[PDB]
Symmetry: C3
Subunit: 274 residues, 3 copies
């Protein structure tokens, strides 16, 4: 129903080639490949073939073969098992928009599937171990969720009605899915609570181990259990300039023309601050 990462890349780049499967195929992979022509990879030529590596180990083996030298990433090959891997173009993850050059792990892929995330910006870097989950209801006698597997139609109706009016947003009910900005960095073993967080601002840094229970302002650096603001990456004038310029939506050419201002915040302020 919803285009996988691989499905989006093939639409964009397969360009009528056949798919050369590198590695042991899976049922999920074969279903995704039914509309196209595909075969077990043997001799591969990027004029004729698109290489799908099934697992990361498959990709590792393929990138080690001399036959891969003529294949360029995403344009001519991809890994099937890496829904959170970044791409050179804006993509969808389970109906969540994800910007260019943004990566995350299966925890966040799940959070996208669970409806917890509104979007993830560009050039955002999320450690694979990050976790994003909602709270369960905290205003009933039980805290379990799978208890509802035992609920009949009537029990489940009252259960849902009280979830729906709970202002603490159990299961992120009746709140906005959170936006994760562009140029965000999230370190290892971090948690973001989907019941109380709607906003991880542009440029925000979430340090390793941080348990993030409330919104992170743009370009704030938060650490600790629970996450506290340690510092801001830039002055407020530089932050508001960054929020107006939005360099993370710049074209590739634009990124290179102004590389100097991207590596020097001082020149960035100088060029764009007024």
């Amino acid at each position: 129903g919803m285009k996988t990462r691989l499905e989006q890349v093939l639409e964009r780049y397969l360009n009528g080639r056949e798919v050369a499967v590198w590695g042991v195929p899976t049922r999920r992979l074969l279903r995704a490949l039914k509309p196209f022509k595909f075969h077990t990879a043997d001799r591969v030529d990027p004029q004729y073939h698109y290489v799908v590596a099934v697992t990361d180990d498959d990709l590792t083996d393929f990138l080690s073969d001399e036959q891969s030298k003529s294949f360029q990433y995403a344009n001519d090959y991809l890994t099937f098992d890496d829904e959170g891997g970044e791409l050179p173009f804006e993509r969808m993850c389970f109906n969540v928009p994800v910007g260019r050059q943004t990566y995350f792990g299966d925890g966040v892929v799940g959070a996208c599937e669970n409806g917890y995330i509104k979007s993830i910006g560009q050039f955002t870097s999320i450690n694979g171990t990050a976790e994003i989950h909602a709270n369960h209801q905290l205003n009933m006698t039980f805290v379990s969720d799978d208890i509802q597997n035992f609920f009949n139609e009537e029990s489940m109706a009252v259960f849902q009605e009280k979830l729906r009016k709970d202002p603490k947003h159990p299961y992120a009910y009746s709140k906005e899915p959170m936006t994760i900005g562009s140029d965000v960095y999230i370190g290892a073993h971090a948690f973001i609570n989907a019941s109380t967080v709607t906003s991880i601002g542009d440029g925000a840094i979430i340090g390793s181990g941080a348990v993030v229970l409330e919104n992170v302002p743009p370009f704030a650096v938060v650490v600790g259990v629970p996450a506290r603001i340690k510092r801001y990456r830039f002055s407020k004038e530089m932050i508001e300039t960054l929020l107006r310029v939005k360099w993370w939506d710049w074209s590739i050419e634009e990124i290179n023309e102004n590389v100097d201002a991207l590596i020097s915040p001082e020149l960035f302020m100088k060029k764009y601050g007024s």
Copy 2:
């Protein structure tokens, strides 16, 4: 003979059907499928077939397939590679009893296999990243465990004898394996120390990131590194009542008959006000 999750479900529900394997069969699967007829899934019909998706992606595929619309969870299908998934009936994980509708990840599966856990309650929800490990010996010149691979039988015997006497339970020696109660909730990146914890009480909530180094009282809410008690979910009076009522052992029929009391603590204390 320690039975997988899948074997326990097949024993209960297969009901003379044939197993239809949805996905690539692994050796762990074929060892588990030994007492049953099975084939590679092609056309399936829950009248003659119980479908075993091997991986999570296999189940995703199967459930995306139109042949699945007639298959009920656990009754007619299961994922083999999810030893921690919840079930509608009480089960074993490495001979550790697990209540109904309780789920957890591979780390807690590993804890069951390592012998760290006596039992896990009903309607308990444990994030898949939770870790439960014991301490190594802390009173020896060395802290390694795998050094013992180099011990000969006599060396190993003195090593084991000191371990068995250690009051601080390295490798959880000489202590009770821990209980995890019912209606327990454990967040992401949590840790429970198997050497120093014997019980996660009924109804406890363990916050994300919490490092749990001592017993968590029933219905306590613990957070932090290390975990400390921020509050209890219910009054002192309600906790005693809950511990007597034990709704988590109720029948499905009782859960629906008394759902009003499950949904409102206020009503629960009226209904069970005089025990």
Copy 3:
């Protein structure tokens, strides 16, 4: 790669001209490692003629529960293909990284060896599989992303690398030594060590579960917390000094067994080696 996997180094050392019997579903990567050898799908296996390679841990568990495994000895006659961080009875390489005997860690630390963040990991060291070791990205530019560099032309890349190599805060662990992780070190679950700011986890160090380690851990220090702080040292300053000279973790196997009384009892260790 140019570089030998753990399995490649084990076969080189012990295969001894035998055929490889594959226990489990082979992978394309495994089949490439096995290419120069005669190999086959494990049916009946005999350690005189076969070396068993289990593909996954699940396969290893299966093999070791099969009666056919009784004759096979760890590493000498069988290994797991996909356990690059597992322990070995001899010192080995993980990518460019020396790793001592009976030392294990998980894929996070494997990745850290591949990234260039680790100089060496000592002997008899135990690292929980969830441990993470990563560096900081640049903190003195307009952006913090790394994959933005996938868009850099050659000129853009050059000014980017130029500034990075001048940064005294070591983004991507630039301009610093890769960290050494000592011998007889213990690292608990959900621990993090910052490769930008740490160059040394001393011998004997204990890093507790949940710790965020932002600076060097002295030898035999016990550190906990976010950020990690020293709770105690395992031994007195004089025994630490004695341990760092004796380096029992470099001892041979017979030495370990002859001196097991000193390894078990720090007090006897001291009377013997402390001068």
